[PDB]
Design a protein around this nucleic acid. Sequence first.
RNA 1: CCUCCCGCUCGGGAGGAGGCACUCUGGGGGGACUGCCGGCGAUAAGCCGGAGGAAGGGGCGGGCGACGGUAGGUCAGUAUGCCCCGAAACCCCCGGGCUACACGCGCGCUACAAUGGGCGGGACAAUGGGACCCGACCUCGAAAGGGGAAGGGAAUCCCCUAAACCCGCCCUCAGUUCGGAUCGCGGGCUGCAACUCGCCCGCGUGAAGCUGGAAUCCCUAGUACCCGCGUGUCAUCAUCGCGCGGCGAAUA
Lengths: 102, 214, 148, 135, 67, 144, 71
Amino acid sequence: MQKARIKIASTNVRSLDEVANQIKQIAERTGVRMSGPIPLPTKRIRITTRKSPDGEGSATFDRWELRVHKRLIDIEADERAMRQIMRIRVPEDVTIEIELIS
Amino acid sequence: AKPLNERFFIPHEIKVMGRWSTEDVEVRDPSLKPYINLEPRLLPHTHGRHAKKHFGKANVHIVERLINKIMRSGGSHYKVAGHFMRREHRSLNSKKVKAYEVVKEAFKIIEQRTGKNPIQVLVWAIENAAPREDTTSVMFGGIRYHVAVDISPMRRLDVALRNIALGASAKCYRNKMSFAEALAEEIILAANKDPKSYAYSKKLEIERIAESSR
Amino acid sequence: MANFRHIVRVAGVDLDGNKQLRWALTAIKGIGINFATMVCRVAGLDPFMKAGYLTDEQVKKIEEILADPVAHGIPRWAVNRPKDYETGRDLHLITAKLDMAIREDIMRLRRIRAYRGIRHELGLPVRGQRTRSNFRRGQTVGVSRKKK
Amino acid sequence: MRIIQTTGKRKTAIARAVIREGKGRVRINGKPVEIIEPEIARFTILEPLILAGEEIWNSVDIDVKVEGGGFMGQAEAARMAIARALVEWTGDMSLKEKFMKYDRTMLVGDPRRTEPHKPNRSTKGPRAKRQKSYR
Amino acid sequence: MGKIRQGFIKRVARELVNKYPNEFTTDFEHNKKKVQELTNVTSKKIRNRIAGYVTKLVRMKMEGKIL
Amino acid sequence: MATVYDVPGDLLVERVAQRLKEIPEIKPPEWAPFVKTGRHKERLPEQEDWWYYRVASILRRVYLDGPVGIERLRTYYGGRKNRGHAPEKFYKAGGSIIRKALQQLEAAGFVEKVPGKGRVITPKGRSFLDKIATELKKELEEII
Amino acid sequence: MAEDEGYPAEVIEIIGRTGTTGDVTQVKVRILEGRDKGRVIRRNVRGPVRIGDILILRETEREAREIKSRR
RNA sequence: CCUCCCGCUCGGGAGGAGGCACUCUGGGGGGACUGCCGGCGAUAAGCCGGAGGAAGGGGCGGGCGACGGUAGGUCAGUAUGCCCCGAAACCCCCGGGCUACACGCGCGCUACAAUGGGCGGGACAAUGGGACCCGACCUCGAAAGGGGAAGGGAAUCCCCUAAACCCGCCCUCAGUUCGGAUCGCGGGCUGCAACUCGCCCGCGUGAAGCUGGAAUCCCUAGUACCCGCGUGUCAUCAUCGCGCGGCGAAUA
């Protein structure tokens, strides 16, 4: 066997949790021991911008959020038990990284 | 440094700034009793937020009130231990933090000469530095008067402490009167009602101009 | 103490006060506040005491650390001018050498016809940028070097 | 013995405190209460410990770790938690009501902490406008 | 500055005491359990208000005059 | 019954700085106070204490930290430099008083460079301290 | 100082507001001093003043007043 | 349980095993609604006061700006009606100009010292940004920086040190040890290249300014006042713009 890390991030809240939940449900029952889906930070990205193209009078200034959230999953299964679980549909728009070590 | 730690064993027990028992004094007048925080305890810095309510500013430790009307004068410019200032003024172009030191050294410099609990000399300087009568250029009904207006115990205190804190910064001006001193030599002479307190010269004039006009 | 005076004479006939040794030399043009405390070390005096508490014997130890400082110690960036007019290795500057050396190099440029020398004659900073309205309301920088 | 873990939070100095029985230990971020240089914010920490008594201060080990920016900030997070560490210990309403009548900065934090710097019309600070003079 | 409950909030609590008056009480949370099940929960904060008014509309219906 | 943890930093520093004169292995080299000093000084002081404090700190800091570097101890002092009317900014000290100091401690056996790339205390640097703090913490109870 | 005569008067009711600067708030006061006792005066009280506050009257012969009103 | 130090042998501290308790992270749920109690009000709406409580009566801070108008602002971001140019009002290039100044004003920074300066020591954050990019740590250099080199495409590493603070020491109110303009020199750094026109470091130089007329601006609480901190754009010009936490009020 081979301890795999699924490191899964997404740009929006609804898309990331459904995959994290589904990954912990399908893997649960087979030849997998699975450590729980741990939430790491939101590296919230602030873009802080000038609205007005005149830059004139008072110019009201847009605050921007890009929030990118990262769930992490350790798993003890084969490379074949890994693809079976990576079958799932996945939101657009959800990055799934795989490191493989023994 | 060892006296400093004795000043940490002693406030514990309980006493203001390390060695002034808050029982030494009493508020003899029943006017300035609910308006003053002589009776409660230990530290001014507190950060207990005031002006929250109608009289959320009466319960302010007398000394904390002192610290931030003694902190007042301040714009823009930048302070740090560097080369670096002024930026914290002849009255804290900056914080109550390095303010609280001044008032402590002024309690030290007013204790050194008078030898009384200095919280008996300052609470004796904020019942005398307040004028008992004021004229407002008040017009009511379109008719311009300059009138008898009597002063409230809360607005008394404020004119007492502020005139004490306004007088010292005219004297400290580029002068050996350090505010730790210039305040400590204002607080003795406002307690006395002396002819040397720029704070008891307005108290009087504001009642005396206001008596003429009535 | 080492024999009180209020006026001892140091660096020729120019006067040493009663302020503090490190501040009394700063005035003597050529010796500053960092260079005063470099010559207190070599000579062997207490730096924080008053000026004027000097016998005759201390006043001679300073005048020979001044004539040539690069002989006693004083690093080749911690001396007054290092590498002078392309052929002197290091020198000393004092009220007469500093006044002459800076007017010389200015006498040099005006003949050269540069954009530094005529920019010191018209009334201007050369690299400080704005002459647009600074020295404002009739005012003046005083350029180099002394209006006291 | 016992382990009663509490918290104390004022203007984002979060104090992590533990109250177990022992011999008069006062630990702050690893160092005794002695290491601090301002006398002042020390006395603030010291306020509750006398209101109850030295009796219970001597009989109990207090270790706190205050991860908070302020010097007075640390102290304040230390004032709120000791007081809550001593009210969980003995259990009575006598030590709780005695704190509340004195000050509410022993047993209430804030409802508020800090406000953002508003976009503003090209100047410095949340609440400020560029100076005018065009009249 | 000043406080006044919105008209959507009063339209809704008024007809909710009209259809099922007797399945409402003078407890806050219970009505709040019922309001949840009858009309939409567009959110949580409004769901406390409608419920806040319905309780007052059961206090006034005892009196004799209800507006 | 004491660590560097138990003693205030105002009483610890003249007791270790003396114990750096007395032992007497660490000493002032002449080039370091002269003009190879840290950033700008309103005056340069002719002090032994000056050298003995810049090192009496260095034995407390490597105690707390593991890999404590040169670039860390240059930036750890606190102090600025003018630019003009532009407000001041944060700069670091002279690396000359820090790179000879660790090496005067390294020959004394108080500090040693670890094989992971860094700077740690020896037992001789760790005991020199706990004895000087057992003397300081004992005196702090005697003195009201 | 010498007293003058401190003529303590505790306010009974706070009728409304006066002054164009707004500054006076007219308060009706009841007296508790050794000479008169009881007198009902309608004095020009400034600054924050609650119901049941104390106000040292300087002169006992006063009562300046202008009145109206809520609808 | 284990390695290191110290010890008055009572006892204090670090490491690793070990443990997810705590802080925290981000996803979800409850809690506040004039519900209750008194007073004012038409017993209605609503306002005031009270208790319990972490928090209260728009809780608090943002985003969220109708029909329109000033022929406001931008065709010099783009989109576009009309007109005009056609070795040119095109195109390529180097160099110079926008950074010229006797002066006037606007917006700001820095500042006129003892609530101070040096020196040393100690206790403290947060947003963020980081691959020709952040750069541990080690070494040389006074330093700016250079040489070597770990980790890091990130809760796991780096910028990083917060600054204000306080305690002791030296210094002892003068245009000064204030203040830093101006000028000589030595020296680094990026780019082809910083004289015009960069910033820093060191030594020398050491200007006005010692609290400012008429007049006038900003803001109402975790705010102002105050202190540093980051980022954008980005080699390099930041006393700017956006944004973070630390101290923490006056009056209404």
